[PDB]
Amino acid sequence: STRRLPPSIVQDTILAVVPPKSCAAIGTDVDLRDWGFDTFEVASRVPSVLQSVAMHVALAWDFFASQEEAQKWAFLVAAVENNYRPNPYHNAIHAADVLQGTFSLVSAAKPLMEHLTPLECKAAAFAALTHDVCHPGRTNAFLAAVQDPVSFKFSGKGTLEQLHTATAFELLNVTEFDFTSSMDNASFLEFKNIVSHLIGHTDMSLHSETVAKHGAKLSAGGFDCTCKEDRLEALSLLLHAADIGASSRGVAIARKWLVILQEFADQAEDERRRGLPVTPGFETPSSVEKSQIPFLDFFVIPTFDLLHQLFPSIEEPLHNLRKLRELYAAKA
């Protein structure tokens, strides 16, 4: 607080209470569990796909004992959406997609579902919801490169992830948003640790490390769901898969999520205007489809291949990635 830095490009948390939007029915019960969910399409014709998804998840997983708790969750989600920037990719639509994705993967894994506690389900849902809150549409490396105050505040790996986590807790701390206020001090602590773990592990830098760790877990026999640390690890793997898994939901849906390149193009341009070195691979490439291939082979496919070995019933995402790769490979 003594060193002189430039103003941050990340916006401070907005604690203001904002009227929640109308939660239009966004599909069937089977539809919400379906990996084929098209988040952009829904956002297309409803007031808020994030708030509609959030409420359907809370109701499907029996989150509330009283209408009071339910109202706080509704106000919370509304305020979380009020804290997502209008980015091409890292926006409230991405958050909704990850929330529904997490909800979809978890409920597709019978054993994990048969063992998850109601508190772990709330924590997983809340984490998916807030995992990218206040994201500025610029990477952790860019924040460091421009010496953004948030890089100095949150030291070590995952600058943004740490910020998303703290922000989610500041919001949850607002009385009208605190749907967990009736929780015991011990339960709330378990809640925070779970949430902190889930969001922290969305940090892309941990990829090599996590794939290796989960591969070792697989060799030892996979997840023992009667063990809470194991359920935490499992949730962590599924949340992550959901976060980077839009391209596994189907060819047509994958096409809609190529907006990530728009954020890349923007950062590349931002860097040029600042006179900084341009991030490799961020400027628009000659062929979008073919540049996607090494990224799917390196990050996405391995993730869903491992996920399929740890939860043998979850096969759809991997087959879709393959169909997608084949299409990109054929492209001229």
Ligand X SMILES: CCCc1nn(C)c2c(=O)[nH]c(-c3cc(S(=O)(=O)NC(=O)OC(C)C)ccc3OCC)nc12
Q: Where does this chain touch ligand X (CB under 6 A) — which range of 178-186, 192-200, 214-222, 288-296?
A: 288-296
Work out the burial of residue 228: count CB atoms within 10 Å of its CB; fewer than 13 is exposed, 13-18 middle, 19 or more buried.
Answer: middle
Q: Determine the Cα–Cα distance for residues 124 and 118; give it in Å rounded to an integer.
A: 10
CB closer to ligand X, 36 vs 281: 281
Please work out the total of residues on this chain that contact ligand X, with binding judged by CB under 6 A. Answer: 9
Tell me the closest approach of the beta carbon of residue 2 to ligand X, in angstroms: 31
Q: Which residues bind Zn ion (CB under 5 A)?
A: 132, 243
Q: Which of residues 110-149 bind Mg ion (CB under 5 A)?
A: 132
Q: Is residue 225 part of the contact set for ligand X (CB under 6 A)?
A: no
Please say if 90 is a catalytic residue: yes
Q: Which of residues 234-273 bind ligand X (CB under 6 A)?
A: 244, 260
CB closer to ligand X, 20 vs 137: 137
CB closer to Zn ion, 129 vs 310: 129
Tell me the closest approach of the beta carbon of residue 132 to Zn ion, in angstroms: 4
Q: Determine the Cα–Cα distance for residues 69 and 79; give it in Å rounded to an integer.
A: 15
CB closer to ligand X, 159 vs 180: 159
Q: Determine the Cα–Cα distance for residues 307 and 314; give it in Å rounded to an integer.
A: 7
CB closer to ligand X, 227 vs 329: 329
CB 182 within 8 A of CB 147: no
C-alpha dihedral (160, 162, 172, 78), degrees to nearest 10: 10
Among 51, 91, 130, 139, binds ligand X (CB under 6 A): 139
Quote the tokens at residue 93.
């639509």
Q: Is residue 281 part of the contact set for ligand X (CB under 6 A)?
A: yes
Q: Output the residue with the shortest Cβ distance to Mg ion.
A: 132
- Summarize the annotated binding site for Zn(2+) as residue ranges: 94, 131-132, 243
Q: Is residue 292 part of the contact set for ligand X (CB under 6 A)?
A: yes
Q: Of these residues, 56, 90, 135, 197, which one is catalytic?
A: 90
Q: Determine the Cα–Cα distance for residues 115 and 323; give it in Å rounded to an integer.
A: 33
CB 272 within 8 A of CB 278: yes
Q: Which of residues 183-222 bind ligand X (CB under 6 A)?
A: 204-205
Q: Where does this chain touch ligand X (CB under 6 A) — which range of 8-16, 95-103, 290-298, 321-329?
A: 290-298
Q: Is residue 145 part of the contact set for ligand X (CB under 6 A)?
A: no
Q: Determine the Cα–Cα distance for residues 153 and 2; give it in Å rounded to an integer.
A: 12
- Summarize the annotated binding site as residue ranges: 90-94, 131-132, 161, 243, 292
Q: Which of residues 101-120 bind ligand X (CB under 6 A)?
A: none
Tell me the closest approach of the beta carbon of residue 315 to Mg ion, in angstroms: 27
Enumerate binding residues for ligand X (CB under 6 A).
Answer: 139, 204-205, 244, 260, 281, 291-292, 295
Give catalytic residues, as residue numbers.
90
